[PDB]
């Protein structure tokens, strides 16, 4: 989440990131329940106050909210104990932020993201962009290994594919920022724009990438002014599931059919409908590719036709249970690298080695009755050094 992203930052980048226009407001909205009120209270104070007052300003009931809010905002470093006055820069910026100082767009975003997903899957016809391709390759969800041949899709790619559009896009932008630092693009400057959306060379390139993702559209031959789409700020289902592992999806966009074919066998394709079967072959194929049953169940549930919404649960229990059992059977045999021991002359030495391995975390499994254990190769060197040291 954005709270995780901002929590994973240094004070020096934090205060700089707290830009005057929007950041002080976007991070404010993040404040779940009580920190908002406390911020407004100590927004006009130039004198720090004791911590005991903050501690006792919440009734005995629901004190966990006070503790969690204080910890979260301590992580954000909005104030300092100074002994709890807010940061002067944040105070000034927030005061400046508080009385101081479309239908075609959504379709464009939908279409652009759909073509991006078409390229993500092995679609023969898709939008071509070398920068987009390499960006997705370095995002960790794609690997090419051969520039001449089109890149394939890694295991993480399928999991990303089956995610819902909001979470999918948000994770994609998270990876964008992390890779922006690696490529050398300043993180603060690009980050502030996202906050400003919900209300330089690097900026132009970043906006080009956003427009490629479909979040924004200049509409005036790449002019300075931009009109963000709905996805920039941050639908009914169509699949019908039977009790015989049969899916009838009212899909006209090829993307949905490809997503369903990733874990089902297609039988018929009507102009406004498609028939698929969820068989062992398809489900285990997806599980081998890397998906897990949770994504498939979630995907079918979210794209659930209104007809089956009346029944509770929406997805039939037999279908859900069969999918889960099919995924479990694949990982019945759990493989774990390790090194076995044999010929323990005395159990005292074996127990001492077991205690050492437990302390270091090297041990993976132990058998007192048989006087043996298994250690990962990483800890094999450590235990070998211990044995040599005697």
């Amino acid at each position: 989440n954005l709270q995780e992203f901002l929590g994973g930052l240094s004070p020096g980048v934090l205060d700089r990131l707290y830009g005057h226009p929007a950041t002080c407001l976007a991070v404010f909205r993040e404040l779940p329940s009580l920190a908002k009120n406390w911020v407004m209270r100590m927004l006009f104070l130039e004198q720090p106050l004791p911590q005991a007052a903050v501690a006792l300003w919440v009734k005995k009931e629901f004190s966990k909210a006070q503790e969690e809010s204080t910890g979260l905002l301590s992580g954000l470093r909005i104030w300092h104990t100074q002994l709890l006055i807010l940061n002067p820069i944040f105070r000034q910026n927030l005061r400046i932020a508080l009385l101081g100082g479309v239908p075609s767009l959504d379709k464009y975003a939908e279409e652009r993201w759909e073509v991006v997903l078409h390229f993500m899957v092995g679609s023969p016809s898709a939008a071509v962009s070398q920068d987009l391709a390499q960006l997705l390759s370095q995002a960790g969800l794609m690997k090419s290994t051969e520039p001449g041949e089109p890149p394939c899709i890694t295991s993480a790619g399928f999991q990303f594919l089956l995610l819902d559009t909001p979470a999918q896009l948000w994770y994609f932008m998270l990876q964008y920022l992390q890779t922006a630092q690696s490529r050398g693009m300043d993180l603060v400057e690009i980050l502030s724009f996202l906050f400003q959306l919900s209300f330089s060379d690097s900026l132009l390139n970043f906006l080009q990438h956003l427009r490629e993702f479909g979040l924004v559209f200049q509409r005036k031959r790449k002019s300075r002014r931009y009109y963000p789409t709905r996805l920039a700020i941050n639908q009914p289902g169509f699949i019908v599931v039977e009790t015989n592992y049969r899916l009838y999806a009212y899909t006209e966009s090829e993307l949905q059919i490809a997503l369903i074919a990733l874990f089902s066998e297609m039988l018929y394709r009507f102009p406004n409908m498609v028939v698929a079967q969820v068989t062992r072959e398809s489900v285990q194929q997806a599980i081998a590719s890397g998906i897990t049953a949770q994504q498939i169940i979630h995907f079918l549930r979210t794209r659930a036709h209104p007809v089956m919404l009346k029944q509770t649960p929406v997805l039939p229990p037999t279908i859900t249970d069969q999918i889960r059992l099919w995924e479990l059977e694949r990982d019945r045999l759990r493989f774990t690298e390790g090194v076995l021991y044999n010929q323990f002359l005395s159990q005292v030495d074996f127990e001492l080695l077991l205690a050492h391995a437990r302390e270091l975390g090297v041990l993976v499994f132990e058998n007192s009755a048989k006087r043996l254990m298994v250690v990962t190769p990483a800890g094999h060197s450590d235990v070998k050094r211990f044995w040599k040291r005697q």
Binding site: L333, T336, E337, N367, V374
Partner: protein, 66 residues
């Protein structure tokens, strides 16, 4: 002593199947280095892939092709 390889844990039925494999030399070698527990055994790392393929064939036998 110290023995290289991998440890595999599975249900007792699969463990018994692995014991049948090693005893009958289905793969041509006694890959089972030792039996850690009723649900855990040790096999050589190099043979894990082919053993897993054999288990997949067993699942094909015990599942109907819908």
């Amino acid at each position: 002593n110290v023995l290289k390889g991998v440890l595999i844990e599975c249900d007792p039925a699969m463990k018994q199947f692995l014991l049948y494999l090693d005893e009958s030399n289905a793969l041509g070698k006694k890959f089972i280095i030792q039996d850690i527990d009723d649900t855990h055994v040790f096999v050589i790392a190099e043979l894990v892939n082919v053993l897993q393929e054999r288990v997949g064939e067993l699942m094909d036998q015990n599942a109907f092709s819908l």
